[PDB]
């Protein structure tokens, strides 16, 4: 029976889409809170859960990756730092911004990635790709007006500006992580999961130390973050978030193996709309002319670019 499901096409895409939604909803649940401040601690727990999960699977012979080598970690530390900066600014941006606004704002990353490659990696941008970049700038502008239509005090606007600062920094940190990691993967030759294994190995020590220096580790503050009554729910949300990162990685390699890479690029772009709607259903998000049309213009822009890369790779 397991063989029948293994080769299925529809199942491979359903598992990936549900694991992507699971990651966003649980991450947003813990992050939002009201008194949550320990962002570094949360990221450290998610990384520890990832290392324990893959360590469990490899023991049972469901996933194969390399064996840690000290000489192989000194050449991967720079990418560990770039991962720390990317995830942290992603938690801050998601903490202050809604899930829909965050998702479309994340499309600004591929503008920096695509134009990052032309300067150094010798790539090019076709007319379809350029037409997309304009639509994702338009979606960004509309969404900014969507949030700004509900702020009427000195506060509730400085919160927006903090959300945009952490979002813009995360855009430049995600572009840097993708480009640099691409440059170094030629040197290291990691293939399927060892890239995730080292990422979540070095990320753990860095996050733990950064939590000690930056976050407030006191008796009072810890009580605010994790009230005794709501400990069980918060802990279960953190565990599901960490194990959802492994679930998406295993279901992504699963999707590519069955339905090729052509369908996986379109599945990632199409899945953005379910991720955005999950914010409206699960959390209180503003609904109006600007915000609703921002989801569909930012969705159309992502779809057009995905078709643009599909055309470029064809020839």
């Amino acid at each position, epitope marked *: 029976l397991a063989t029948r499901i293994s080769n299925s096409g529809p199942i491979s895409i359903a598992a990936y889409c549900l694991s992507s939604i699971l990651m966003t909803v649980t991450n947003k*649940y813990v992050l*939002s*809170g*009201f*008194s*949550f*401040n320990l962002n570094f601690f949360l990221l450290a727990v998610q990384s520890i859960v990832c290392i324990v999960t893959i360590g469990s699977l490899k023991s049972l012979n469901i996933i194969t990756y390399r064996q840690f080598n000290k000489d192989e970690a000194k050449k991967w530390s720079p990418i560990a730092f770039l991962l720390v900066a990317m995830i942290y600014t992603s938690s801050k941006a998601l903490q202050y911004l*809604s899930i829909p606004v965050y998702t479309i704002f994340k499309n600004l990353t591929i503008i920096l990635i695509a134009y990052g490659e032309v300067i150094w990696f010798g790539g090019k941008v076709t007319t379809m790709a350029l037409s997309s970049f304009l639509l994702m700038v338009l979606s960004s502008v509309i969404a900014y007006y969507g949030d700004n239509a*509900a*702020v*009427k*005090s000195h*506060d*509730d606007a400085f*919160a927006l500006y903090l959300g945009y600062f952490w979002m813009l920094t995360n855009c430049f940190a995600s572009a840097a992580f993708v480009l640099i990691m691409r440059k170094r993967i030629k040197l290291t030759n990691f293939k399927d999961f060892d890239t995730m294994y080292y990422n979540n190995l070095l990320s753990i020590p860095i996050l733990l130390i950064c939590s000690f220096i930056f976050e*407030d580790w006191s008796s*009072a*503050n810890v009580s*605010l973050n994790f*009230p005794a*009554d*709501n400990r069980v*729910t*918060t802990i279960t949300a953190m565990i599901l978030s960490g194990a959802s990162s492994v679930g998406i990685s295993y279901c992504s390699a699963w999707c590519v193996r069955v339905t090729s890479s052509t369908t996986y690029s379109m599945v990632g772009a199409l899945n953005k709309l379910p991720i955005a709607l999950s914010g409206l*259903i*699960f*959390f*209180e*998000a*503003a609904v109006n002319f600007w915000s609703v049309s921002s989801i569909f213009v930012g969705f159309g822009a992502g779809l057009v670019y995905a078709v643009a890369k599909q055309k470029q790779q064809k020839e």
Partner: nanobody
Amino acid sequence: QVQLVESGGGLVQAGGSLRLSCAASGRTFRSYTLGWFRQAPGKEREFVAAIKWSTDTTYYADSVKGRFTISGDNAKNTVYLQMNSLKPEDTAVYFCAARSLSTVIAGPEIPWPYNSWGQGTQVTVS
């Protein structure tokens, strides 16, 4: 540190009126639902009222409909809970709980989605 602080509790004769507040020592109540619970001396926590900050939609408990009035002043990030015609049974510690999840997944009367809580204030009615 972000904490919710209540004020206005005290002792009031039966049939009187009172007002309680729930301020914030940090971020704003935008995109949150604020609820008011009560813990009688020897019973469990009970829902009293709730309000959605942005859309100002209020959900009221069964036994406090037509007596209480939860309202929100957007100019100071404070949530009020007027109490009228208090019966002696209202004696309890009133807590304020912030929340982010939506009412679709869990009802407004369920405590688990409430991820923050204030210390609370003793309200006594004789």
